[PDB]
């Protein structure tokens, strides 16, 4: 390898020190995998061993590449990211193509390897320090720091941005209608082409990047034009009971925090007496009319809801049972930028944690394609459980921010 | 004079700072003349060096005396320097657990003397370690010094010494991969399956290698023989246990003493099964005064008595064999306390432990069991680097029902059912749909925040109405009280309708126990009922759900 230019100097925000984060305990399997991977990486000059005079640490995990039988090392750079990249969202910050979500097909390619041929600033290397843990704290961990641009660090594509633009320039000339956006280790490519044409063009880009020196072990298609804010659905019933009208009035009353132009009164007058829950109550004209008015007002989106770039994105997920999960991406309460429902194959494959994980990945990817940044999740799972099992089913190269919720949503079936 | 040709670790001062300028005059002539004697001998060994005072720095130097005063000891307070020095990598946060150690035919403990003083200090940093011995009154020129090696009490000493020791062991471990060396503070712990003769030969070889680098090791045999008392553990050749625990007898207990007691019991719980800290720690709920005398309750003394009866006879843990399965077994103690044993063998425990739920007002057995399984999974991953097969006192139907209808996503690995009671079951289940042919109770409750009087009542579809007055209550408590009333006055199958999202939230969580007596009574009622359908409606929207 060679240094194409000198190393791009990297500074943090003045007053901010390097990341210091504990290394999560790992299975012997994953530890051995990381040991092999890092032995080879040390052999190739990508990383070097460090002494006690380096205080900083960043977590490391072992996952599967995609479906692959070979282990892949996933570094969690979220802290270092937050420290450097908020300045590198400014100085080297990559612009987001808001027209990407309009394309009928979007394919994701993994360009990460590109970063490994580029050296890292000598003064900055000490902040890339990570630790391969030992079982039962028997030995102090094995400590490395990166000699080259690390994967998972948002500064890496920022530094490689010029080279990427240069390499992509010929392809973008022959294909002016194709949108290409680089988020961290991944390249998102949109088109309006037929699936066959789209895949052929993606393969063209693969061979183009390959003959220019960029290996992409992609050897996964979205459709963002169908992505929107889902309408709230009122139950369609031939007849009704007292209980049903109660659920209806309740749900609508909850929806009033969203669409203030909803009136539940005429439905309230129909239950007026004190009745058994199972008593069938036929709808009147003044009632049914109100039901129709509240139905037609619920299919039209909200007024005054826009995306604030100064505010973080928040993704809430709730479990619907039977392999179904519902989610909302918002910023301020009750103003929803996005809503959706993730589903999976039913039985003898997936469990709860797997489904939630894949859901989080899907939501995160959507958020990347749309707003150019990832949401902070509120996860319906026990903290330690998730922290233990999240690396099993994780196929993504990035890590979204997350926290954990108690006090179960009664919304539930309402969404 | 064991000089060390060891590569030094480069050290910096925190950016913007400089060396400590603290000056020390005091005090006594005797201590001064005692300092000279030691400093000359340290200089002879090259550990320190005199310096011409060209704008140097300074650090306070005291002198103290151990028991058996034939030997003086010099002390240096590096606090001010330690503030200004750069941060270093943490040395060792946690310690290895004996249950995770593996059987070795021979084990040797080697403690290295003059550990820090045998490891050189970075040259350019040495000037920051400068200190002065005071002249005897008379404002006379003092004796300047600085450290050429790792000073005791200096921030960077333990980590630098650790890494230096590691690099020193590096060429030796390469020639002897069959032997395993652990490194803790000033101690090395070697072990091997080699025969005693070859083992001792290798130990002596290691001692010689270490001595070549300027690190001394014990001459007579090698030091201690098993035990092996280490970090509050007793390590035997074929077994491990905890150092003897002493539970003091007192006529009066204080927060401090209860802290020590709960500490000892917790520490003992890793091996002796059955230890219960719940009541004794519940005594400690008040965080206010540390010296406050706290009266023990009856449940607390009972619990402590059971703990004494458990601690009567000694028990031991075994070591880990990778070739055999890892099994975890959990039992409920009934108070919200759970106990567990981890074993590769039926009569032999690797270790034991307990899980208690401190957080939350209400919960159920299945959830607590899940949390326990979580804790054991984490602990197992830490200690043995894998996860155990679980033997659990819960039917697959109960578990599956619970996690299928649970709002939160849990998980448990492959597990097998154990019929040993008390079994974990679902004591009641709410109906998912309203009950035809069941009386419908519309319940409500209210309270005045000031007077705290309030009332709770119901009105049914059969025209039955009741209002019961309350005292010293709150809105939530009346909201639960109304539902309790409806449960009391109805048949085996009942439809309740509440205006309370609170009460609905508590009940829908299906708790089998709570720290509230009211919730417990409601639980009992829900158990006694054949069918209960609880439903919610918006409060003060006036449909069928009006006030009282
Ligand atoms: N002071 C003091 C000594 C403390 C000490 C601390 C640790 Cl972490 C390990 C240790 O012994 C070992 C050293 C190297 C490998 C395995 C070991 O243990 C294996 C288990 N074992 C324990 C005692 C015994 O006699 N035989 C035996 O097989 C000793």
Curated annotation (Swiss-Prot), chain A:
Motif Tryptophan repeat motif covers: 386-402
Q: Where does Mg(2+) 1 bind?
A: 110, 185-186
Q: Which parts of the sequence belong to the Reverse transcriptase domain?
A: 44-222
- Report the outcome of residue 186 to E: Drastically reduced incorporation of phosphorothioate nucleotide. Loss of pyrophosphorolysis (reverse of the polymerase reaction). No effect on RNase H activity
Q: What is the effect of changing residue 187 to R?
A: 20% loss of DNA-directed DNA polymerase activity. 21% loss of RNA-directed DNA polymerase activity
- Reported effect of changing residue 389 to L? Almost complete loss of RT p66/p51 heterodimerization. Complete loss of polymerase activity
Q: Name the reported effect of residue 187 to V.
A: 22% loss of DNA-directed DNA polymerase activity. No loss of RNA-directed DNA polymerase activity
Tell me what the record says results from residue 167 to A. Answer: 71% loss of DNA-directed DNA polymerase activity. 61% loss of RNA-directed DNA polymerase activity
Outcome of swapping residue 65 to R = 10-fold decreased sensitivity to ddATP and ddCTP inhibitors
Provide the site residues for: Essential for RT p66/p51 heterodimerization: 389, 402
User: Quick one: effect of changing residue 187 to I?
Assistant: 29% loss of DNA-directed DNA polymerase activity. 46% loss of RNA-directed DNA polymerase activity
Describe what happens upon changing residue 110 to S: 5- to 12-fold decrease in affinity for dTTP substrates. Strongly decreased RNA-directed DNA polymerase activity. Slightly decreased DNA-directed DNA polymerase activity. No effect on RNase H activity
Q: What is the effect of changing residue 153 to F?
A: 10% loss of DNA-directed DNA polymerase activity. 22% loss of RNA-directed DNA polymerase activity
Q: Known consequence of changing residue 65 to A?
A: Strong decrease in RT binding affinity for all dNTP substrates and in catalytic efficiency. 100-fold decreased sensitivity to ddNTP inhibitors
Q: What superkingdom heads the lineage? A: Viruses
Name-wise, this protein is p51 RT
Q: What is the lineage of its organism?
A: Viruses, Riboviria, Pararnavirae, Artverviricota, Revtraviricetes
Gene assigned in the entry: gag-pol
Q: Which residues of the full protein are shown?
A: 600 to 1026 of 1447
